[PDB]
Design a protein around this ligand. Structure first.
Ligand SMILES: Nc1ncnc2c1ncn2[C@@H]1O[C@H](CO)[C@@H](O)[C@H]1O
Ligand SMILES: Nc1ncnc2c1ncn2[C@@H]1O[C@H](CO)[C@@H](O)[C@H]1O
Ligand SMILES: Nc1ncnc2c1ncn2[C@@H]1O[C@H](CO)[C@@H](O)[C@H]1O
Ligand SMILES: Nc1ncnc2c1ncn2[C@@H]1O[C@H](CO)[C@@H](O)[C@H]1O
Lengths: 227, 227, 235, 235, 227, 227
């Protein structure tokens, strides 16, 4: 029995759009038909409504692997099995501009903690999203003529430990942006059998309005989610 | 400049009581004189008021090491340097009862992400609270005739990876309870030069109402913070 | 200058089909127009010719991460920058039949050795193939009406290492097959800037040792797949 | 049965003051009433007598984690369960003068063999002394008007290992001194169920190699502190 | 049934000289009496014949730990139990000249996959050759009046990641040369009960005629194997 | 200036026989000509005298890697450069009887602090003795008709954590006995340029005359040191 998200079974859809910021969940709920607040416990706002004749929920996951792991596990216990994370990220390469999008194809991460507790050892398990769902995202973002890039990201655990040596190291490893929850989402999804994907809004560039960019892409994500 | 906690510098006190649940922050603010909401961005509610002739803030830190690390770093950037975490925990031994308290003397943890990024290697740095501040807590709880225990806790990163083997392993290692933020709080405080401590309310017992226990202990915590 | 693959300037194409078995490299070369043996030093056979009127090369990479790492580095020094591995694999799930194909989307691996020397620490860098090239492969195989599955694989370093929980461990982690070079191929490519992808022919099923197939049916599978792969490299 | 400390039933007290130097164990035994040598095998001297009308023992633990682990395990088999280590240390901060004292609140350490063998994995288990016993030491030292500091220490395994940033590294991590046995003492105690604490006499300052102390002044410091320690052990 | 070395049962000797290069195996087979090619699959050439009235085989092992592991395992399944590797190496000390020989007494290695899969943990198991067999090699080489040095070598997994800082680091760790298969050979042999050793021909010096060297040594090696 | 071994410069020989037990050091000193005690500090007894027309020292190293490292370092600062450890060990194979000897060819060890502090990373550096010195030991024990076995040993750090699962694990990894200082001695010697070896007396057999045995062996050891 979930102890963080206090929604009743049947109040959470199988399809869920997950965001870190409670405020974004509230803003994006205005895109659903007849949205209802199914949970507010511990600040994790969850809204359930309709979109393209499909029931969908928008849920808050907070910051970090431990936080999103808990939210995903409990949403799953209430019926969810398809998740698409819509967050913000810091670009690691110069050519990507603010307000543009990144569709994630994989996540790099440092071993330990959460991963050791779930996997039982330090093996580097491929942290990747569902192949088909990610391709649908690309197709959806193209249909809407939105500027996007496709690549891997580094899921950091320490926001304030990202210096300059940091940027060169990670971009030289094939990552084009940094965020904090993708590796946990993809890996846990692989173990639990959930279908997940992620699209990010570039809010900063470490190598070198948000709300407007957020709204445009949210519609592309919702279309993908309900397709 | 902080991008999560949007409080104006000067609106955050040097002394801060930190809690994981936004709802508890709101509930505990009623114990302050003339409380003002100084931040609500991303759901991290921060209240600032007075207590026993001292300015004090009550801040939300969310769940997990990555989350509290961000909140502490930003509160510190706004002026804070003394932190006392007041959370909930699951007892790992049979004799501790629900509603009783645990004053923390140390935190065990699994190596990984956050710690590697801050410490730069995998050394096991002693994750302990400020000695003087912790003794003051013990004195305050005794004065108010509250039932407490003193011991180490295990700071877990995966709430849903805690099985049977789990309880015996950690209690046999000298830990009497499990929570998720103490190790990050103590270690980062040692590195940043902050004075930190922690008191926990037992909400569950893994070996074998909350609001009531929470309110009683909050006063002892605030007395300690303003002494 | 390369000390294993002794090829001269302009003899290696930019686009290369890489396989572990030199016997297969020779066999596949017969699908090209006027194939020329560019290298045979240390057994690493490399042929260069044309397909659909396009210049391409087929090279041998041997067994394991250390071997394919050396071959990829020297081939790139000779001018290559696009690599598609075409090999064999063992399925980790019961529903995949022998002779079918697996288009790789990522590779799991145990930390250490080669990765520590190249990456300088033990971070788990995402080991994935080029997004676009992989989708081209999916398109090519479906147009050839071939049966394939899409998923991650575990790149093992010890073919004969015992683990009474092997199949269950890796299959429970999202992997549908096991081989030995993909992690090295994908990670080294991300670090060096090469575009890589991988397609594997199921030559055995570890989750069901009851099934089997003969070379007549296997080589047949290898041949049909090579055509789809070559189409993609020439696209 | 113990194979290092050859003592009989009842020769070892429940409360034990442990020191690394057998020469110090002998010297300190003169503070007890009717001291009796209960062991001398392998150089690990153990004396048993009375202080303030209380039976206690002073034992030698040698240098390093592996050594003190063996000694503590055998002393416990002989009946001991309360241990207070009293040793020497090197300060990692400039403001601590030689001859002063450090009451340990925790110990930092590098993952390693000893801990892996006992813990069965590499988790960073909190290495802390008994809360109450440590507070008794603080009270005792202040009542004897002695200058002390409270803080964490780094338990090193390599006295002569080179590290250009040693002092800066550990002091920046909240440690004010370095020694070699505390982490093993605290962790093994938590695991076995013993009550332990530690008090150290600063015999050098790595953050200031300029200051020095003479043997007469030092032993003087050791003597004074030992009284406070013994008061606590017999409280 | 071995899937790489398809030699017939009885076609592989108990005594085996292993080399990484197929061409060297071919070239060395001319030192045997009545040599017959017993395997060609996957390029792993294996020849079997006689020398000093004893049956002996010369096998190709390819490049790297994973490759030699497979070959050794299958050769053993076919009856081999004594292995002597004859390869090339890069000197890490300036006093060793090209063409001279190095008789290995131990192998340094970085912890990694292969060792983890076979050992089941990160323990540093001593990677050493058979003591008696190694002394027989020393005798054979001095008897033929050859110039050799006895010492430890570093078994690298990444040929193209061995920069300059490389030389100082490994030479200061007691290693006088670098190659890529010795650690695997020695450790696997200790676990399986095989008797192994290694002699190397210096083909390069990273701190600072050939054909003849290879041939000269091969004869000293064959005498040892058949002693 | 060494702070543990207070011997005067010139009072310590270049050739040193090291033992863990102070009592054995005292006992073995009677084998030297005109033995003089050169150090007593901290219980680390050191005697110096002559044997076969050569200056030799017998030093106490205490128990464990950290202890022998300190002693070896200070003895070297005083002029020692050739070390031969003579200790006791527990056999890991049933065919080795009490009182017999084991000449060590290598040492297995678990990654740990001491090796990390000296090596600066987790690399498994070959922990082996000097090849020449070890062969001289074999010769010495043969000329005296003593029963010995050559093989690798496991250098444990936790004496009281050596259960039964223990025996099968290390014996299957090619180790024939367990002790506590060889890994440290061999690795530190390789890094420092010292020549070291080790002979052990089997005191116990975990798979299934300490006076007389020790004495008989010590003589073979002293002959080797002065050859
Ligand atoms: N520069 C950045 N580094 C790490 N996370 C970032 C960054 N920019 C945005 N984020 C994302 O936004 C939140 C932190 O602001 C986290 O949930 C994280 O996923
Ligand atoms: N059983 C438990 N395991 C881990 N954290 C717990 C437990 N009970 C309460 N907590 C604390 O409460 C939150 C999760 O409920 C986290 O912030 C954590 O610190
Ligand atoms: N400098 C070197 N570094 C690594 N391996 C080498 C070197 N020189 C020769 N080799 C050996 O030759 C092959 C690499 O050319 C491998 O099988 C390896 O054992
Ligand atoms: N069974 C054993 N396990 C570990 N060390 C042993 C054993 N037998 C003898 N020793 C050696 O003797 C001492 C422990 O009695 C240590 O110095 C160690 O090297």
């Amino acid at each position: 029995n979930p102890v963080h998200i206090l929604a009743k079974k049947g109040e959470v859809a199988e399809r869920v759009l997950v965001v870190g910021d409670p405020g974004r969940a509230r803003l994006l709920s205005t895109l659903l038909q007849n949205p209802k607040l199914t949970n507010e416990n511990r600040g994790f706002l969850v809204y359930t409504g309709k979109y393209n004749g499909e029931t969908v929920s928008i849920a808050t996951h907070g910051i970090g692997g431990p936080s999103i792991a808990i939210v995903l596990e409990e949403l799953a216990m209430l019926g969810a099995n398809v998740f698409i994370r819509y967050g913000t990220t810091g670009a690691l390469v110069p050519y990507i501009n603010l307000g543009e999008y990144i569709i994630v194809t994989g996540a790099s991460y440092n071993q330990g903690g959460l991963f050791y507790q779930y996997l039982r050892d330090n093996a580097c398990v491929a942290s990747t999203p569902d192949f088909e769902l990610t391709n649908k995202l690309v197709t959806s973002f193209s249909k809407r003529n939105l500027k996007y890039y496709v690549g891997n990201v580094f899921s950091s655990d320490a926001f304030y430990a990202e210096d300059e040596e940091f940027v060169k190291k990670w971009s030289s490893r094939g990552n084009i942006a940094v965020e904090m929850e993708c590796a946990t989402l993809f890996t846990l999804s692989k173990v639990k059998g959930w279908k997940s994907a992620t699209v990010l809004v570039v809010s900063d560039n470490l190598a070198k309005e948000l709300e407007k960019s957020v709204m445009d892409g949210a519609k592309a994500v919702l279309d993908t989610l309900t397709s």
